[PDB]
Design a protein around this ligand. Structure first.
Ligand SMILES: [Mg+2]
Ligand SMILES: [Mg+2]
Ligand SMILES: [Mg+2]
Ligand SMILES: [Mg+2]
Lengths: 7, 236, 236, 7
């Protein structure tokens, strides 16, 4: 699991 | 020049429309055009850039993995010869993936990174630089594999050093950076122990900083912390 | 010429690989190349052609609908003016959709339909001709809307006439044709009663022919019959 | 619901 999406 | 005649603000507006429409190639081209206007990117704009290329390269990576698996089965005991087509088409997809990675890296090098003075922007871009060298590493098989891997490692390391000095342990960019560097260690660098150690330390230090946060920031941070736990559950 | 230098069989092999990889633009280009070799298409090959362009135009239609909805909201009482960008980007997507429809129609006209002598191949292609004029009709707003609609209707009608004479009521192409002509009537031709009548008659005549079928053909036919029922449940 | 995928 990677994380490339912010909020 | 592709997008040279469109206003910066219009390119940003159209990138947001393309995201809504799930038109991520369009999204990426619009954001590439916005970057090429030469001004620094805001936080929301950096996000749009990352989301666009994440989706484009994500579809390419998924296709490459499908085709690589088929190709590998074709090279087993008992497999009938099917000719050059599987390798050719895998190479076609690989080449287009590499071109997308090269395009992103070019944007980072000309000139996003050198103008990024704030911790949040500089770490964001260095994380991207690590990510897109990692995607190049996933498909690398020849003379330059080691240099590609070291380029990913170097970008991630510089980003980690800045994030540690300049950002709290719960910062979402710091956390997503550490998550992905941990994935690099596990999947690329044949260093699963480093991957596990980094994920654990990252999770525990964020846990101990959650008390400082608002409800909204706590939601943002704990979302990424769960991905660290998911990896640790997979890896141990 | 794009694919002019690749063997027909290699283009077919690569179309199947692209489907597996969910690379449907690639799939369509490979099948376009295969058609342009000039030989008729087998049943499996016609399927690959249809699947490829269904997916390409399907993504374009979904994006166009998203953007059209946004554009329509922009033209309501109380909506702040946002400038030309939404219309421009909707037009961009619409133009590329129209180009894809035109490409498929060109393949049908040069020369798939005229060489298709068997009922199954001729109905298959005429159904496609109706489908891709229907997609053009979904976005048509000017002088040629009525002619585009009549072109869809005419293609569907010729296919229906052949299918009725030459194929059993449970034939999957006959059933998918009737399903889509019914959708044309409901969504394009402002004829919901015709749409409902066609769907009902199609379903009832297939029901009465299921007894003739093997277990495998029964599965194929009842799958499409359920889509007729789903539409009838939506429309009544 | 339309149907454009046979088997
Ligand atoms: Mg300007
Ligand atoms: Mg600066
Ligand atoms: Mg030949
Ligand atoms: Mg013939």
């Amino acid at each position: 699991x990677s994380f490339x999406x912010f909020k | 020049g592709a997008m040279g005649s469109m206003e910066r603000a219009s390119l940003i507006q159209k990138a947001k429309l393309a995201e809504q429409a799930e038109r991520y190639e369009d999204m990426a081209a619009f954001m590439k055009g916005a970057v090429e206007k030469g001004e620094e990117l805001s936080c929301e704009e950096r996000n749009l850039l990352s989301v666009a290329y994440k989706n484009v390269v994500g579809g390419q990576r998924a296709a490459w993995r499908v085709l690589s698996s088929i190709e590998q089965k074709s090279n087993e005991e008992g497999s009938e010869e099917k000719g050059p087509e599987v390798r050719e088409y895998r190479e076609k997809v690989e080449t287009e993936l590499q071109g997308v990675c090269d395009t992103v890296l070019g944007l980072l090098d000309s000139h996003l990174i050198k103008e990024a003075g704030d911790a949040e922007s500089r770490v964001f871009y260095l994380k991207m630089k690590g990510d897109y060298y990692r995607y190049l590493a996933e498909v690398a098989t020849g003379d330059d594999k080691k240099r590609i891997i070291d380029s990913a490692r170097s970008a991630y390391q510089e980003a980690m050093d800045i994030s540690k000095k300049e950002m709290p342990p719960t910062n979402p960019i710091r956390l997503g950076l550490a998550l992905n560097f941990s994935v690099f260690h596990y999947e690329i660098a044949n260093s699963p122990e480093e991957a596990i150690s980094l994920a654990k330390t990252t999770f525990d230090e964020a846990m101990a900083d959650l008390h400082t946060l608002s409800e909204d920031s706590y939601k943002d941070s704990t979302l990424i912390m769960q991905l660290l736990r998911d990896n640790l559950t997979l890896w141990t």
